[PDB]
Amino acid sequence: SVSKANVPKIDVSPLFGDDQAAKMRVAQQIDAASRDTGFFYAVNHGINVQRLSQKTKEFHMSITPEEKWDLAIRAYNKEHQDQVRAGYYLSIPGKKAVESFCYLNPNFTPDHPRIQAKTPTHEVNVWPDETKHPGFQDFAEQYYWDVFGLSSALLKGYALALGKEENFFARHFKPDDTLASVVLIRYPYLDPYPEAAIKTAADGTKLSFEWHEDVSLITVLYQSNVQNLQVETAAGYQDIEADDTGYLINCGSYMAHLTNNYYKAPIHRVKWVNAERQSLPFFVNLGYDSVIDPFDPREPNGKSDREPLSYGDYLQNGLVSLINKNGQT
Numbered sequence: 001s002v003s004k005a006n007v008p009k010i011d012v013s014p015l016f017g018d019d020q021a022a023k024m025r026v027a028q029q030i031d032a033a034s035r036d037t038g039f040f041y042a043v044n045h046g047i048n049v050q051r052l053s054q055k056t057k058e059f060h061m062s063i064t065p066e067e068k069w070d071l072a073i074r075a076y077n078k079e080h081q082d083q084v085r086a087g088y089y090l091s092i093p094g095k096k097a098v099e100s101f102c103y104l105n106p107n108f109t110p111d112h113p114r115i116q117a118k119t120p121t122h123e124v125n126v127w128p129d130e131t132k133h134p135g136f137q138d139f140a141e142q143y144y145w146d147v148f149g150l151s152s153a154l155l156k157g158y159a160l161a162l163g164k165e166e167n168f169f170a171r172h173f174k175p176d177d178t179l180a181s182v183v184l185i186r187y188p189y190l191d192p193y194p195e196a197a198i199k200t201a202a203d204g205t206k207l208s209f210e211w212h213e214d215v216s217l218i219t220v221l222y223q224s225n226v227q228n229l230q231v232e233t234a235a236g237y238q239d240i241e242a243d244d245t246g247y248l249i250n251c252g253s254y255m256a257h258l259t260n261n262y263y264k265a266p267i268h269r270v271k272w273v274n275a276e277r278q279s280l281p282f283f284v285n286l287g288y289d290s291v292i293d294p295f296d297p298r299e300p301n302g303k304s305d306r307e308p309l310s311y312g313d314y315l316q317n318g319l320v321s322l323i324n325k326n327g328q329t
């Protein structure tokens with residue numbers, strides 16, 4: 001058998017309030033989890049995840065092949081040269097099971113200065129027809145702001161955990177410029193399930209997505225109650241138990257960079273499971289020009305031998321590298 005990963009459930013509700021003592025105790029829990037397996041569940045997070053799941057299901061199960069082409073990213077539809085990130089990511093029956101829809105900051109409007117400049121990683125979201133998907137765009141945009149709010153609170157916890165003032169990360173995480181994304185991923189039940197859509201790890205484990213580190217500062221993830229994720233530890237790969245009432249939180253490689261690897265980006269992978277399920281990450285990305293000066297909370301003077309890296313650089317190149325390593329999703 002595979003052992004269960006330590007993934008503590010942390011009540012993050014104090015991070016929304018003004019009790020500094022209570023916030024420090026939450027920060028300690030985040031520090032402990034970040035130094036151990038690198039995963040925890042945020043509970044008492046205030047988001048209606050059942051409604052998120054229901055609205056997402058309604059979308060995934062009603063969108064048509066025609067709409068998918070019309071919303072497709074550039075990788076699937078050469079007509080859509082502006083859609084590197086945002087849009088529909090198609091399945092390929094017989095070959096690729098997963099499909100998804102990605103959207104970015106709703107404030108990336110046609111008049112936004114980064115959209116006008118055509119700065120990489122900024123795009124105007126594409127949406128299905130309102131009549132075909134009533135309420136979906138409005139729900140999805142509001143969800144962006146709900147999970148943005150949770151993420152801001154979590155970032156206060158991480159900052160305090162690292163010995164910083166609570167706005168150390170959050171001051172770079174702003175509604176007008178965040179590069180954060182939501183992805184609404186459908187992993188289908190299929191009978192028969194295409195073997196071409198299944199990868200095998202060195203240890204024989206059947207996978208839907210190979211080992212990787214996240215391209216994010218942190219990742220704030222809702223999933224169904226179907227166990228699938230594994231994290232690599234010193235004791236080997238361990239199963240992360242599902243909890244469809246919580247958000248699974250981990251650091252990405254930008255956090256590892258900033259902290260000189262004190263908070264590592266945990267290596268994880270996705271087991272193949274023949275089950276209809278949802279994976280709904282929010283990738284907490286900063287602004288394109290955000291630069292956090294790296295430091296080391298294990299060294300007396302906090303100094304680092306890493307160089308500052310702008311977030312936009314990190315993200316554009318990180319997303320391309322992840323596609324190269326683990327395939328176009």
Ligand SMILES: C=C[C@@H](NC(=O)[C@H](CS)NC(=O)CCC[C@H](N)C(=O)O)C(=O)O
Binds near residue numbers: 085102214215279
């Ligand atoms: C987080 C869970 C999910 N994995 C993923 O979403 C995988 C590895 S984290 N991530 C990606 O492909 C990066 C998508 C980035 C997104 N298009 C954007 O432009 O910002 C899975 O369930 O497979």
Ligand SMILES: [Fe+2]
Binds near residue numbers: 212213214268
């Ligand atoms: Fe991941």
